Amino acid sequence: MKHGIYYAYWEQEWEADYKYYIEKVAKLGFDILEIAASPLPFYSDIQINELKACAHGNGITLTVGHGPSAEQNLSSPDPDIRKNAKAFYTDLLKRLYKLDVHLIGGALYSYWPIDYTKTIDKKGDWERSVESVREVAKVAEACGVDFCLEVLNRFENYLINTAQEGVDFVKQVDHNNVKVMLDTFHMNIEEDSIGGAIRTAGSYLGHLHTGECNRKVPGRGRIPWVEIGEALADIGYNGSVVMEPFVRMGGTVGSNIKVWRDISNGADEKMLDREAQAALDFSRYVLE
Template identity: 65%
Template sequence: MKHGIYYAYWEEEWAADYRRYVEKVARLGFDVLEIGSAPLPEYSRQEIQELKKCADDNGIMLTAGYGPTYNHNVGSSDSKIREEAQDWYKRLFEVLAELDIHLIGGALYSYWPVDFADADKPEDWKRSVEGIRRLAASAKQYDINLGMEVLNRFESHILNTAEEGVQFVEEVGMDNVKVMLDTFHMNIEEVSMGAAIRRAGKLLGHFHTGECNRMVPGKGRIPWREIGDALRDIEYDGTVVMEPFVRMGGQVGADIKVWRDISRGADEARLDEDARRAVEFQRYMLEWK
């Protein structure tokens, strides 16, 4: 397994200098930094080269995450939006390839956060399957896997359980489209964490971790031993990226709905130490080889 963390753990705004976090996570004992995709298509050649060199120099693998905007919804009922989304992702894939990023995960089948007033699950599902099938063909040219993140009912209406994730991926029928599970969302929706992981089985392509309270692993009540046993049973040896959100303020706090200081006033040094301990804990609980 390769263990990582999402850069926004330290941020109040989505915009960030990812190089700073590459260096930080390398010092803290991580293998992977997950970065946000939104700004990447606008990166200059120099920015791409500098980020790639920084990751290489620090021995850090990069993965990408994305909560698509309304205009990047490949399953939209508006054909113009669907085409705009496909075009945008094609530009993104070119940059991901230059950064040697081979995995992007999130609600790529829809947009985030969803306006449920217009939700029509059967029709949205159908268009999303078609949209992801097209998207996967574009991504395959660059050896990029797409992680279909299963979200809780308050953030999406399309994929809420591992069972639905598997059904969706099987309907798409492309070998670079994978199920992506997240312990925060699983805690809300799944009857059994272990059973959900086993249901995903060989289709599991990316795994997000975090406590039920959005703190780093080890500071809540998620059943980590059960999760580790299930990952061992399916012989999962991919990326495991923690996605904690503990700070109020800014667009990150507003979008993630952090309405109290979960960090309890932690400064950056404290956040760093919590992350360092969390990756040690995660390796201990989840590694099976």
């Protein structure tokens, strides 16, 4: 099992010098660094090539996460937004190929975070979404990318909140390059059973995000890690496990994640490094 961490653990915006973090997590011992997709459309082929060679240099595999904007909403009733959305993913997926990135994940069937003042049309958005995603999936297959649909709690998305819903959606899309993606922070709120949710995901599970109930690094909270290790083994899980902890207030990140107190408790970068590393040793130990 490959273990990684989301660069955002150290940053407050959906961009950063990914080369800096590639070097950092290589030395902390991770196998993967997960980066936000939004700055990638602004990269020249020269920039793409050196990010790839840097990852290759430090032996880090790169995975991508993305919280779509309203403009990239594949489920939109607006046909122009859906058209712009597909063009965005078509370009993005092609860049992922140039980067030898074989996985992208997040609320890709919608946008994040949802603006709840709009009016929800779950039934309508769901049907439009399944159609849009199946299309994008052809481009994903061509670029060799696993398009992972993350199940989110109710406050962040209304389309897919439980693993069963995720499996329903993915089965309805019916394209091998579309997988279900689970996240322990999200399962903690919505699921009746954690091992149960993983087992329900089964062969469709393409990616796993980890964090404690309140998003601290994995291990000293209430998430049932041993139960998760068991269920992953039950489904013969063959994917990466990326920790996505958020412990700092401020910026677009603190605001979108809703960190309203200093959960890191004054950690400086070295302290943050120490804990991610301890949480990595924990995860390899307990989850495999």
